Amino acid sequence: NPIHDRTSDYHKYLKVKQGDSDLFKLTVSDKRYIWYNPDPKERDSYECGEIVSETSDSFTFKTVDGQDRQVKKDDANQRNPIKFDGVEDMSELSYLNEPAVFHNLRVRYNQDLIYTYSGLFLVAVNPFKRIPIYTQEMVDIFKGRRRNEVAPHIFAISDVAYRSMLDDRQNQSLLITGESGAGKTENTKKVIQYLASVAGRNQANGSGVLEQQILQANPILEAFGNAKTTRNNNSSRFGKFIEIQFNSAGFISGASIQSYLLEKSRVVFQSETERNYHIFYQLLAGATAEEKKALHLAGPESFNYLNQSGCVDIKGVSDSEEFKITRQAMDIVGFSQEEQMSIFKIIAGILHLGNIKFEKGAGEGAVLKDKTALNAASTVFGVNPSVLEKALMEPRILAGRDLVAQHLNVEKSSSSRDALVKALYGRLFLWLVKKINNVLCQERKAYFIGVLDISGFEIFKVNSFEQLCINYTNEKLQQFFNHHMFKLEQEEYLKEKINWTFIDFGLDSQATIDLIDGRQPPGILALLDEQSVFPNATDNTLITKLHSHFSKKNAKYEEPRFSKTEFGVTHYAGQVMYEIQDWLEKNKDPLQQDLELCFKDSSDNVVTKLFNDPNIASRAKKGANFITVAAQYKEQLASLMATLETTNPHFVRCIIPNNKQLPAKLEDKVVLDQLRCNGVLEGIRITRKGFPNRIIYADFVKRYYLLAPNVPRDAEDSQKATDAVLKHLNIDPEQYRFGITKIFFRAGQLARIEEAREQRLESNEPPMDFDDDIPF
Ligand SMILES: Oc1c(Cl)cc(Cl)cc1-c1[nH]c(Cl)c(Cl)c1Cl
Ligand SMILES: [Mg+2]
Numbered sequence: 008n009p010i011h012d013r014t015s016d017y018h019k020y021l022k023v024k025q026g027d028s029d030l031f032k033l034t035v036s037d038k039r040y041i042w043y044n045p046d047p048k049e050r051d052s053y054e055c056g057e058i059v060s061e062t063s064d065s066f067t068f069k070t071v072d073g074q075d076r077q078v079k080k081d082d083a084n085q086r087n088p089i090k091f092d093g094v095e096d097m098s099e100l101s102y103l104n105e106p107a108v109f110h111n112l113r114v115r116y117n118q119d120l121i122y123t124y125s126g127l128f129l130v131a132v133n134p135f136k137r138i139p140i141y142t143q144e145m146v147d148i149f150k151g152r153r154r155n156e157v158a159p160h161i162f163a164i165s166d167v168a169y170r171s172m173l174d175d176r177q178n179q180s181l182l183i184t185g186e187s188g189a190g191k192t193e194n195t196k197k198v199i200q201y202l203a204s205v206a207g208r209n210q211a212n213g214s215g216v217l218e219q220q221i222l223q224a225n226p227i228l229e230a231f232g233n234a235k236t237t238r239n240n241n242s243s244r245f246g247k248f249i250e251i252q253f254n255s256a257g258f259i260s261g262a263s264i265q266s267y268l269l270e271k272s273r274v275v276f277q278s279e280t281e282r283n284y285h286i287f288y289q290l291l292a293g294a295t296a297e298e299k300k301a302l303h304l305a306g307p308e309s310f311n312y313l314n315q316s317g318c319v320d321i322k323g324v325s326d327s328e329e330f331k332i333t334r335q336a337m338d339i340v341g342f343s344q345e346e347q348m349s350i351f352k353i354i355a356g357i358l359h360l361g362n363i364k365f366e367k368g369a370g371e372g373a374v375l376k377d378k379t380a381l382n383a384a385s386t387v388f389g390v391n392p393s394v395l396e397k398a399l400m401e402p403r404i405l406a407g408r409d410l411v412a413q414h415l416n417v418e419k420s421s422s423s424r425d426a427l428v429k430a431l432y433g434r435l436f437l438w439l440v441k442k443i444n445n446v447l448c449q450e451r452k453a454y455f456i457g458v459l460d461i462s463g464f465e466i467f468k469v470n471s472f473e474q475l476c477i478n479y480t481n482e483k484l485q486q487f488f489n490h491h492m493f494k495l496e497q498e499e500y501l502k503e504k505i506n507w508t509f510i511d512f513g514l515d516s517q518a519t520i521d522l523i524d525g526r527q528p529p530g531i532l533a534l535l536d537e538q539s540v541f542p543n544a545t546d547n548t549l550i551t552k553l554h555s556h557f558s559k560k561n562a563k564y565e566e567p568r569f570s571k572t573e574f575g576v577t578h579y580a581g582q583v584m585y586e587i588q589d590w591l592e593k594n595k596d597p598l599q600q601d602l603e604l605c606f607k608d609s610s611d612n613v614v615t616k617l618f619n620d621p622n623i624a625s626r627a628k629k630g631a632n633f634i635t636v637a638a639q640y641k642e643q644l645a646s647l648m649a650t651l652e653t654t655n656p657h658f659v660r661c662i663i664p665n666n667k668q669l670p671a672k673l674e675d676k677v678v679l680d681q682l683r684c685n686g687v688l689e690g691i692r693i694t695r696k697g698f699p700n701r702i703i704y705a706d707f708v709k710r711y712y713l714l715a716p717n718v719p720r721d722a723e724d725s726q727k728a729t730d731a732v733l734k735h736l737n738i739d740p741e742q743y744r745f746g747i748t749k750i751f752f753r754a755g756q757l758a759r760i761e762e763a764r765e766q767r768l769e770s771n772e773p774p775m776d777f778d779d780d781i782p783f
Contacts, residue, residue: 020138021122023093038057039086043056054071084102086107087101092114100691116134117673127694131659134664135672180656183459184463188239203218203251217261224443235282245462246268247266263447276315291326312358352388353435360384371414388614431617437623438613441623462480475585482579483648489686491656516578522564554566564576595636698752714764
């Protein structure tokens, strides 16, 4: 058995190595230690010290330098006996404090053990290197097992969610949190792989094609939705909720993807060191010379949208190679050969639109002297060059019921051109998801397991509207964890009259959430929207109004003294300064009508569908104004959060080791901040101090059959039939508790103590067969 075979890859890559005789001598020692700060200023840098003596209220130890210090037993972060070092579930630690938790993760990390349980949820520290722990062999390991039977792994928590989906007939969800680069996407891929395995149909015609397409749906989304940012080479620039559908029996019947917040502005601009979306680079370097000449494509350096960051390649990634994988993925999912060609003739078109150079004419209006880029764009898009030109520089609008042609200056024509580009890309991205959904969505499933893979918390030198929406979302997800771990848990105990004194874990980011999406009084997004439909509003009137409402009034808001165009929001993961530039236009997300008219007449099927299809080219309208981006998003997110509330949540906390994307470099300061703001320790405390399991009094006749005074499934008094199979083995009485309608178990009695009554190999058929047929 791989599990019990100390030579298996499983025991080599998922278990803690056997300590040697020298480590044993240290393990059996009587000496005690404490975690302390050598430099009181650097509170996250710890060293180990031996406790040499104690008072009734203090400990005295010895600093690595031989120095001696005294601390109060209450302010002491004691070090757990080393037999705990590497423990797979930290809720089992004797001492639960920051240095102790970080240490255990470190010990496991140093051995390439990136997974560790922290009570009910899983913690994943990004290794930044490959570890052979995701093979089909590994999958077949964890298929069918108890979480406490196998080692910590993303597969394990995946199986658990899967078993719970069946045993309870309830929909589940895998919520994977983490700042940018932490490992959310990578783990998301494993959840799907595992589920498409243990639940897929026998790999065959359709029987193994559905789950094959499900897996190929993501490589597509990645080429168009991911890009290199300063924090992650493969950063997801869009959020994703993936539903894995199962039939009544329990088999995969399909899936659907719901995307959120594509960072459209990236197509036309990238900070020094960033890249545009991967797809642009894969095309230029992976297309045939004929395709290259058919789309008038050159090198990345010959396009404004690709030669501004100073970076066109990623260390260890062959864009030419990835292009093959994307195409190959499009084939499998079901994209026609024409569609694909269209898909690249919009991508190629976008690059050309970027090269259009507008210039100041004789007046203030713009003019296009060199039309090489313009004609090339029109060419591949299949639209009239003359019409697009006029639409770009001279769009028509209404003025008091009068059609008057505009003549935009250089700056404005440039923006309109960018506006067109972003609309094309965003719509194209939406189309792909739609196309992909139709292929995977073809069955009325009953249960589903939702996998959430959002853009993680991020901070850059310059943070704009996009970052606010991203961080607001991560703030909601964190509060979703706070809710289901501390609030809902304690309201249960409350109504359950189990005798619990309320605990305040100090984890609540509702103030910050309100400050952003509040309506009454109005939060940032509200004020933003208000300004967006104000005729005379400007980025200046917006920042001023925001300061007016929150400066020195909201505790999570800050009007900086060093700038007049930024405001700081204090998030769970830290304070972020936001630059207000362009927020109004970004919120309104305008696009000249002429531009759309121009493209509605494209000779290309994909292009026309992006401009004629209501569910893609249309915008929900609020009265005389279109719905803003802030409002649309808030709406979308609230919906998602509404869906998760109807599922049984399984949490996975991804942790980034450092900020350099380097392996074997676990920085304590970087890791502890995350452990604190994620509420990892409070989540462990709530489990050790509480009662997770809670069966109803009625259905309490489940695994409890005659293991006491004879009492089968039946009893006519429930409160009574309950303390009945328990007292036999005289289980500790304050190791559980009785509630108004349920029975709670501390630190999991069902597993800790109940190991004889259940999980036995005796008590079913051996306690009753001694005199089977032979009695005289
Ligand atoms: O990107 C857009 C711009 Cl600029 C304007 C309008 Cl009126 C609609 C969109 C739009 N609609 C839909 Cl539906 C998607 Cl998806 C996108 Cl993107
Ligand atoms: Mg990601």
